[PDB]
Write a protein that binds this DNA or RNA. Structure first.
Ligand SMILES: Nc1ncnc2c1ncn2[C@@H]1O[C@H](COP(=O)(O)OP(=O)(O)O)[C@@H](O)[C@H]1O
Ligand SMILES: [Cl-]
Ligand SMILES: [Mn+2]
Length: 451
RNA sequence: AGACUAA
């Protein structure tokens, strides 16, 4: 039994059995991260189990550290700055960090227990990690716990909450506004506003600030300084990207959710390429997670979820299913085995098994292009599998005529590290490296040989 | 677009 939001004294022993994968499918705010997780960790320490804890984002990592403070845990995330003895048997890191470690040099510990929080995260690295984890379990080398309110196949955007939620459909602005949206600033509580991009977030926050609103912006770029401010200071709005979609305890009263964002899609008509499609409706799982930021406090009964449009369950044309396979085909168990995707996530795309496996040197290039090059999984794979070395940038210029990149409707030209002026015309097109002006600037640095 | 930045 438990009280006062404190971890339970009692933990089922069966969750620690090798060959067992436990899905903890409990509604938002039930206590997965800050109550159940510490119980598991405490018991895993008593059992002397080599343990891995996985957060999707630094937001969830920060929530975990609050719940786990004082326990001998080695934090491998910049979100947390803690003293480590180097003798810890519990590691904590983000999903993508684990997959990166799996892909690289560099022996990963043989964990006996793996706890993944937000085990539905559709990031290609997270899907890949779930493949590796479920394979370790199946092989008898690990027990694993997958925690999420929205496990694969979830279709309900309005799940259970600790307190009643008032679900409201209204038009929501995507850009600044003058009139017509008084309900936004008339509201007297705290609002978490999900925006599809940092650029849109800047515009909306700037607009809210001219109404005399205290606004905190949250994203990968601002997390380090801004997240503690959501915890320690008084604010009216949090304008946030998907960084905050999961796990956050904002102690807020309202979520504004336009339920729409851009997604990478692989096109297979004509030469294969990646576009940024949409903005398109989010999945029911994403909508339920965003909504799940409120109705979290039983003593607070008038919380609101303001949304626009229906969700779209079908995400099968999304690049993340293929990119997860590209990653997982290149991960090995120490026994030598090919990891398979987590059951519920198999046959999301009709790609043949092991078809993305790279040979030795090409595998090393593949990792470099992602980590050093800041290139998407798909693009890194295309370049690596063509036998191109990390430093050879000729492919950025030898694409067909139609692959010419434009900026402000002019042909982008590169001045190379050796002095030549060349037109940016890559052999493979991935809109993620040219759509956003900042991304294009970076890809221009890459094409120059300055990355 | 968004997230991740570890041996
Ligand atoms: N800093 C905090 N102060 C007060 N209550 C909190 C705090 N953080 C979390 N809670 C509450 O504890 C409950 C369980 O939280 P959590 O473990 O984050 O839920 P889950 O992981 O299932 O979404 C929620 O009702 C939440 O609002
Ligand atoms: Cl909360
Ligand atoms: Mn949680």
């Amino acid at each position: 039994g438990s009280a006062m939001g404190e971890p339970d004294y009692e933990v089922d022993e069966d969750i620690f059995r090798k060959k067992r994968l436990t899905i903890m499918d409990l509604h938002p705010g039930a206590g997965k991260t800050k109550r159940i997780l510490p119980s598991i960790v405490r018991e895993a320490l008593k059992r002397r189990l080599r343990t891995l804890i996985l957060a999707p984002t630094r937001v969830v990592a920060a929530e975990m550290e609050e719940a786990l403070r004082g326990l001998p845990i080695r934090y491998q995330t910049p979100a947390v700055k803690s003293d480590h003895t180097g003798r810890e048997i519990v590691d904590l890191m983000c999903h993508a960090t684990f997959t990166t470690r799996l892909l690289s040099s560099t022996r990963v510990p043989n964990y006996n227990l793996i706890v993944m929080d937000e085990a539905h995260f559709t990031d290609p690295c997270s899907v890949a990690a779930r493949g590796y984890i479920s394979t370790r379990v199946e092989m008898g080398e690990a027990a694993a716990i997958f925690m999420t309110a929205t496990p694969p196949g979830s279709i309900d955007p309005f799940p259970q909450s600790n307190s009643p939620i008032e679900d409201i459909e209204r038009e929501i602005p995507e850009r600044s506004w003058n009139t017509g949206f008084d309900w936004i600033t008339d509201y007297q509580g705290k609002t978490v506003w999900f925006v599809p991009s940092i650029k849109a977030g800047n515009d909306i926050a700037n607009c809210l600030r001219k109404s005399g609103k205290r606004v905190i912006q949250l994203s990968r770029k601002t997390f380090d300084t801004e997240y503690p401010k959501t915890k320690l200071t008084d604010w009216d709005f949090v304008v946030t990207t998907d960084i905050s979609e999961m796990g956050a305890n904002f102690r807020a009263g309202r979520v504004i959710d336009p339920r729409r964002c851009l997604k990478p899609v692989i096109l297979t008509d004509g030469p294969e390429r990646v576009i940024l499609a949409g903005p398109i409706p989010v999945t029911p799982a994403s909508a339920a997670q965003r909504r799940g930021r409120i109705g979290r406090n039983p003593a607070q009964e008038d919380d609101q979820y303001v949304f626009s449009g229906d969700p779209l369950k079908n995400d099968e044309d999304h690049a993340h299913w293929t990119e997860a396979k590209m990653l997982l085909d290149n991960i090995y168990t120490p026994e030598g085995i090919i990891p398979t995707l987590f059951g519920p996530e198999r046959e999301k795309t009709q790609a043949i098994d092991g078809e993305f496996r790279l040979r030795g040197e090409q595998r090393k290039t593949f990792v470099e292009l992602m980590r050093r090059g800041d290139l998407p999984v798909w693009l890194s794979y295309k370049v690596a599998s063509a036998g191109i070395s990390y430093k050879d940038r000729e492919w950025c210029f030898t694409g067909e005529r139609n692959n010419q990149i434009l900026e402000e409707n002019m042909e982008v030209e590169i001045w190379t590290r050796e002095g030549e002026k060349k037109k940016l015309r890559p052999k493979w097109l991935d809109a993620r490296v040219y759509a956003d002006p900042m991304a294009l600037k970076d890809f221009k640095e890459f094409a120059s040989g300055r990355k």
